[PDB]
Amino acid sequence: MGQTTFTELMQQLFLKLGLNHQVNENDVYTFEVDGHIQVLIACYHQQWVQLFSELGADLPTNDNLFGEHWPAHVQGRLDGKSILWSQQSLVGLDIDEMQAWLERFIDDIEQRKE
Amino acid sequence: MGQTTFTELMQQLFLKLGLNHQVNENDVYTFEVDGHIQVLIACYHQQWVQLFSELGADLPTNDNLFGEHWPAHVQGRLDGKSILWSQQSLVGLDIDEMQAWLERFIDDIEQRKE
């Protein structure tokens, strides 16, 4: 509430996923899939859950249009590194949708790599 | 379900702002700000409110990083025209955040066109 709601949501998530993870002092949750995809999960302003992943080799530019995923997955740049991110509001976010969104996000990264 | 909430939100929004709008047959809300800026608002899947505006030129690239606004404003590329868009769930969007968000988006547009 809102960090506590986030922390209890993260706890349910990692249990349901049976995934090793890390949490730093900033409440940023880190995990790795398939020994290469590192995914970061953070809560901003006690309200917005933010997914983030660094896209690794150099990837072609995305038109960054909405419509393909809900919420959208956005390909950005950062220190000259392509990254992918997606966000949604914590309000009325539950574990089933949190799990589905994470799955969607992982599948897109997996595909963008290619 | 979701669309009535959306329709009620939009109706309230237009009154509060004292703006002329149109709605087409797809429930997409159009308006002009100060008679130069055109913002489009639609609801997808009875869940996602989507803000959209053509930036009206071919504007310089944007690293497209989250973090400057909540929810983020993304500058995308559609048919060689830059556009700006922003989304968030309809669950816990009330008239008050709906109004502030719209104002942040408008302000950003006003700045981005230069």
Q: Does B110 touch chain A (CB under 8 A)?
A: no
Please give the method by which this entry was determined: X-ray
Give the best residue of B43, B61, B64, B101 to mutate against chain A (max A CB count within 10 A): B64
Q: Does A97 touch chain B (CB under 8 A)?
A: no
State the residue for tokens 């997914």: A51
Q: What was the resolution (in A) of this experimentally determined structure?
A: 2.0
Q: Does A42 touch chain B (CB under 8 A)?
A: no
Q: Take residue A5 and report the two structure tokens written for it.
A: 């709601």
Nearest Cα neighbor of B56 from B22, B25, B81 is B81
Q: Take residue A94 and report the two structure tokens written for it.
A: 């539950």
Interaxial angle between packed helices B95-112 and B2-17, expressed in degrees from 0 to 180 and rounded to the nearest 10: 60
Q: Strands across the sheet with A22-23, in order? A: A22-23, A29-33, A37-44, A48-54, A81-89, A74-78
Contact B109, B75 (CB under 8 A): no
Nearest Cα neighbor of B74 from B38, B112, B36, B43 is B112
Indicate the number of domains in chain A. 1
Distance from the A8 Cα atom to the nearest Cα atom in chain B, whole angstroms: 20
Write the burial class of residue B43 (CB in 10 Å: 0-12 exposed, 13-18 middle, 19+ buried).
Answer: buried
Q: For the domain that residue B54 is a member of, what is the CATH number?
A: 3.30.1460.10
Angle at B83 between CA B78 and CA B85, to 5 degrees: 115
Range of the structural domain that residue B83 is part of: 2-114
